[PDB]
């Protein structure tokens, strides 16, 4: 019985919460606060440990870009710093392959990164790998068949709909079919054998639509849209279902958590976070 962890986020300022939802009985846990409040970070899990990567601390008296990596042990209910990234990375995307963490893109003030770096836990170290084809902030990331997909984002001029695929054995990137819809701050995950991208902001409106990529057809197909339009949401899969947490919808900060059932192509509301927020790092363990 694994949990959905939610870390950081933003409400009136960047938050430092760590909370976890247990989908089999609907309860929320109030776990240890992060060391430093952060939103636009990403979360992932490696060998039962949760990690929070990048982001920004947008406080009321000015904002700092985070290059930090922190690790939480559900056993000790404790965070611990890990080596920092080579560079501050706000609105970063993250995927895991072979127990190695890929820190993809993000921002540093005006700098929109195309650089990617890899973290090896067994030796607390970050190593620059090959940069992506496009600079990307607010990028969704998804790992499939031992490859990493970078989806959507913003290049420092345009909000993107393009997507790339990284090949770790070859250390190189390749563009793939663009998405139907342009998407900044979408949630990107992997359910069954497809990459999903839900919500985001298209340059005009915050979206509720959900499209999925098929690796063999190379085509994107919309599926049932969500009930609530949202951007800078958190996403993850827990037992064959997609879970989306909060986000911003052009008006307020959502506390709403929707669940996607792929068999029946429907969405439903399964719970509310204890408080509405956007830009959270989400993972399962």
């Amino acid at each position: 019985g694994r949990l959905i962890y939610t870390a950081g986020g933003y409400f009136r300022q960047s938050l430092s919460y760590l909370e976890a939802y247990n989908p089999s009985n609907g309860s929320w846990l109030r776990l240890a606060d992060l060391q430093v409040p952060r939103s636009g970070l990403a979360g992932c899990v490696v060998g039962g440990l949760l990690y929070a990567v990048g982001g920004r601390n947008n406080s009321p008296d000015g904002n700092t870009d985070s290059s930090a990596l922190d690790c939480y042990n559900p056993m000790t209910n404790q965070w611990s710093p890990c080596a920092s990234m080579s560079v501050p990375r706000n609105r970063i995307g993250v995927g895991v392959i072979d127990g190695h963490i890929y820190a993809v893109g993000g921002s540093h003030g005006c700098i929109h990164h195309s650089s990617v770096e890899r973290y090896e836990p067994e030796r607390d170290e970050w190593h620059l790998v090959a940069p992506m084809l496009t600079r990307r902030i607010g990028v969704g990331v998804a790992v499939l068949n031992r490859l990493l997909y970078a989806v959507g984002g913003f290049d420092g001029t345009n909000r993107l709909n393009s997507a790339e695929c990284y090949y770790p054995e070859r250390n190189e990137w390749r563009m793939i079919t663009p998405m139907n819809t342009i998407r900044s701050g979408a949630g990107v995950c992997v359910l069954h054998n497809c990459i999903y991208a839900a919500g985001g902001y298209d340059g005009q409106d915050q979206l509720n639509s959900v499209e999925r990529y098929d690796v063999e057809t190379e085509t994107w197909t919309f599926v049932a849209p969500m009930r609530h339009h949202r951007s800078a949401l958190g996403i993850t899969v827990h037992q064959g279902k997609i879970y989306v947490l909060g986000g911003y919808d052009g008006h307020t900060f959502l506390d709403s958590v929707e669940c996607y059932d792929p068999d029946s192509d429907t969405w439903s509301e399964v719970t509310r976070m204890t408080s509405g927020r956007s830009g959270v790092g989400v993972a399962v363990t």
Binding site: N58, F154, G185, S231, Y248, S278, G279
Partner: peptide, 11 residues
Amino acid sequence: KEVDPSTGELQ
């Protein structure tokens, strides 16, 4: 206030 439309954040 001014808010980044894709995240809701300020400035």
